[PDB]
Amino acid sequence: YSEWITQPNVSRTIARELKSFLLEYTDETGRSVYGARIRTLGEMNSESLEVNYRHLAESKAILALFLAKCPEEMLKIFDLVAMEATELHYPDYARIH
Amino acid sequence: MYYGISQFSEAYNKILRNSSSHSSCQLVIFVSCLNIDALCATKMLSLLFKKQLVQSQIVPIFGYSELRRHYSQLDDNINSLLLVGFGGVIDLEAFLEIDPQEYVIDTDSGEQSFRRDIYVLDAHRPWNLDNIFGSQIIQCFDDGTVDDTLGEQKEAYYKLLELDRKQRKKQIHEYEGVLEEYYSQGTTVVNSISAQIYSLLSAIGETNLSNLWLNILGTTSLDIAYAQVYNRLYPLLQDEVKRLTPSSRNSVKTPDTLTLNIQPDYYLFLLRHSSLYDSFYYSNYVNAKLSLWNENGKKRLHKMFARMGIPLSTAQETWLYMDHSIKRELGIIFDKNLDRYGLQDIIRDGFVRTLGYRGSISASEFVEALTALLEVGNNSAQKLTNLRKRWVSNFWLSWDALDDRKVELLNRGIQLAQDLQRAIFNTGVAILEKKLIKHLRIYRLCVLQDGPDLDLYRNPLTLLRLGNWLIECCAESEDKQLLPMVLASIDENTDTYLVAGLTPRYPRGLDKKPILNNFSMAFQQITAETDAKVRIDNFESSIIEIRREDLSPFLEKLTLSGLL
């Protein structure tokens, strides 16, 4: 698994995949959950984004399997994706964290 | 009319001719305390009469009762008075029981002259026409209003005075109509007294950076309530700053250099002494735009700093120690962000002063410090008199804070301003959370019955702080109709409410003709009908104090009256 996550074509695809998850996963009310959580994260000036695993098991579940089987690599990618998502949502959050 | 803007010099020359000598003190300055603009005007005036070595007395006065007290105990040696910040809106000749034949001297010739001048330095309007035209002793300094506007009222006044038959009846009915349409206008302030005195100094040639700063301060005090007037006067202040600024460029900061600048002075509350966070938080305008009195508005403010890229810890640093890169960049950060929140009117160019190495102060911050000193710097009628004495005594703390030799007292003013605005904000969120405002058909009513800080709101200025905070919150909502407001607070010691009748105003960024305070004469009319024991001797006659039991009958008659 780790050899697969670190293969750079796969890694770029994984980055787009988790970014798509944080953008387009919704509550059944249609709200993007991770939109709201990123909004809250910046309002709290927090370094941590709470991701629910079941939401990833519900959409693009291969990423959830990778996250279970190979978390050291996968969290490394998912952190960069989360930073990109919040920097998109809050420009210059790189100055805060 | 009496002394136009073009001829204040003649009035000042008359003051020196009549009331200057090495021999004797002859000039008395009555100044309304609890008025920053009157304070600054009196400071400029006192520096002028210091330089010209005129022996003179200043008496700070709370209201018309204290005026008529102090006037009654002036010796005949006193042949000039200056009434600063009051007296225009009332027939002083009748109120002080003047008889010109009791004051006339050396009439010879179709001519008159008098043993005491009474000059009036007041920016309140409408002028009482007996001061402007009726009296030969009362001498009002005019901004131009009388010559610009009151020709018809002048004509009506003089003809009705002369007009002691059907044509005669129709004419006196007509001119009664004119004068009773001129009276029953709502009250409004049209100028800064300090800029009026500055025009006098310009006519004498006495302008300097001290007097210009005092003019800026007295003028800046109008900005909360009378923004249109401040926008009239701001360009002239820019002209004078450029005229008096020295010629050196890229000047090295030096212990002796007083530099007075035009530069970005944001609409934030005590930015250079607050933290950045607190300067947003306790600003009237920011609270109005963000609806900051509730948790969702607080979340929005956090959202704002997060999108600015400013850490909340950095935002909460005391501004001196806050990150230098952020302070250099702050104008760019505001420009890039505040339109997204509708806070674009935070951007403003205002007057900043710095004196050597002891750090910058804006006119905004300085007037806040001065008001804080006026508010909190230091059998019922006796207790009320002792209270009003405390406010008279606060005047000299604001006065002394105007001097660079006593900047520790200005720092006391800054601290008291922060804690006052905290009390204002806490009482305000109490009002808006619990919905103390009642939406009566003609005006909004708010009455403070109980709670903390209630012993502050017996001061008229602190009550007006809460009123202005509420009114800024109302104005920035499109939901609310722009009704006038009544705001009241009980004094549990005197058993009297202090009641303030407050104008509405348009939202801060928009531009229209000013809207006038008609609570002044409305309170007078209810007072004239009623048996209630209400006092109306405060100089700002839209503020009264009334016994607790009388309030509900009074407000019932107020809302049944059509005057509002």
Side-chain angles (χ1 to χ4, degrees), chain B residues 285 431-432 435 459 478 515 536:
Chain B
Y285 171 90
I431 283 161
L432 298 174
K435 300 299 180 81
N459 180 283
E478 296 185 344
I515 56 184
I536 190 148

Side-chain angles (χ1 to χ4, degrees), chain B residues 26 46 86 89 126 138 190 194 243 365 398 409 411 432 484-485:
Chain B
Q26 284 171 264
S46 75
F86 64 91
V89 299
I138 309 300
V190 303
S194 54
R243 190 175 68 82
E365 279 142 341
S398 302
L409 182 55
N411 272 262
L432 298 174
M485 180 179 289

Side-chain angles (χ1 to χ4, degrees), chain A residues 39 42-45 88-93 95-96, chain B residues 299 302-303 305-307 309-312 326 329 333:
Chain A
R39 207 211 83 207
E43 277 151 27
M44 298 292 98
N45 300 80
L88 167 153
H89 192 107
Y90 281 113
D92 301 322
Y93 202 76
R95 304 179 81 161
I96 299 178
Chain B
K299 236 68 69 176
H302 285 57
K303 198 195 294 185
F305 287 120
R307 199 188 174 91
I310 293 175
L312 183 57
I326 299 295
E329 199 182 336
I333 289 159

Side-chain angles (χ1 to χ4, degrees), chain B residues 378-382 384-512 514-529:
Chain B
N378 279 289
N379 188 258
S380 57
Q382 289 79 356
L384 166 142
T385 299
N386 292 335
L387 183 64
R388 290 178 173 197
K389 277 175 178 180
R390 195 183 194 92
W391 301 332
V392 165
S393 195
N394 287 348
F395 180 89
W396 295 115
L397 300 171
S398 302
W399 180 277
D400 290 339
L402 294 167
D403 188 351
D404 300 321
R405 294 179 296 180
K406 284 176 161 56
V407 286
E408 74 284 18
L409 182 55
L410 181 66
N411 272 262
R412 282 196 67 226
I414 289 287
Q415 180 59 46
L416 297 164
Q418 291 179 233
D419 293 332
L420 266 164
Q421 194 70 2
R422 202 188 321 287
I424 298 304
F425 191 95
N426 289 344
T427 310
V429 303
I431 283 161
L432 298 174
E433 286 265 75
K434 281 62 169 187
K435 300 299 180 81
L436 273 288
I437 291 164
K438 304 304 182 188
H439 178 73
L440 280 60
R441 182 173 70 258
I442 295 138
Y443 59 94
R444 293 191 181 96
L445 176 62
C446 183
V447 183
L448 283 163
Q449 308 288 18
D450 196 3
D453 309 330
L454 205 68
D455 58 337
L456 304 178
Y457 298 112
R458 56 186 169 165
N459 180 283
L461 285 180
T462 314
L463 187 61
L464 259 285
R465 288 181 88 108
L466 185 59
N468 275 296
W469 188 94
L470 294 161
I471 285 158
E472 291 292 334
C473 187
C474 288
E476 295 297 323
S477 68
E478 296 185 344
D479 183 23
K480 285 180 172 177
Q481 181 184 3
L482 296 178
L483 294 180
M485 180 179 289
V486 174
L487 175 59
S489 182
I490 184 61
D491 175 24
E492 288 288 348
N493 305 273
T494 314
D495 207 4
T496 52
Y497 292 97
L498 187 71
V499 185
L502 313 174
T503 71
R505 48 176 174 271
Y506 315 106
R508 173 61 60 162
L510 278 292
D511 180 13
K512 298 182 69 166
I515 56 184
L516 280 45
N517 198 323
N518 54 350
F519 287 109
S520 52
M521 97 293 292
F523 292 170
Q524 285 177 17
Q525 293 289 354
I526 303 309
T527 298
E529 185 273 352

Side-chain angles (χ1 to χ4, degrees), chain B residues 8-71:
Chain B
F8 292 174
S9 170
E10 284 84 329
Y12 158 86
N13 291 343
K14 187 174 181 174
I15 291 163
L16 295 187
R17 284 165 51 216
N18 285 4
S19 307
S20 173
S21 65
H22 80 282
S23 173
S24 314
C25 181
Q26 284 171 264
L27 171 61
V28 170
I29 297 156
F30 293 163
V31 58
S32 51
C33 67
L34 306 189
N35 184 324
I36 297 291
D37 190 23
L39 162 59
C40 293
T42 306
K43 184 69 176 180
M44 294 171 65
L45 190 69
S46 75
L47 294 178
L48 174 63
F49 290 127
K50 171 189 288 184
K51 177 179 169 286
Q52 303 300 106
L53 304 175
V54 179
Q55 292 200 109
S56 46
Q57 184 178 18
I58 295 156
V59 186
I61 298 190
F62 176 80
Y64 286 115
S65 179
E66 289 208 310
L67 173 64
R68 184 159 45 72
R69 185 205 297 156
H70 286 304
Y71 184 82

Side-chain angles (χ1 to χ4, degrees), chain B residues 44 192 194-217 219 232-247 249 258-262 351:
Chain B
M44 294 171 65
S192 64
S194 54
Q196 212 149 289
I197 299 298
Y198 193 86
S199 76
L200 169 55
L201 296 187
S202 298
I204 307 156
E206 299 293 345
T207 54
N208 53 35
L209 285 167
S210 300
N211 287 321
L212 176 55
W213 185 241
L214 290 167
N215 175 19
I216 283 161
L217 290 175
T219 299
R232 291 203 312 101
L233 297 168
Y234 175 87
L236 302 171
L237 300 178
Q238 290 197 126
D239 298 337
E240 288 292 295
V241 165
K242 279 199 74 64
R243 190 175 68 82
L244 301 179
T245 290
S247 59
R249 300 291 170 259
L258 189 175
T259 60
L260 169 53
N261 293 342
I262 303 152
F351 304 99

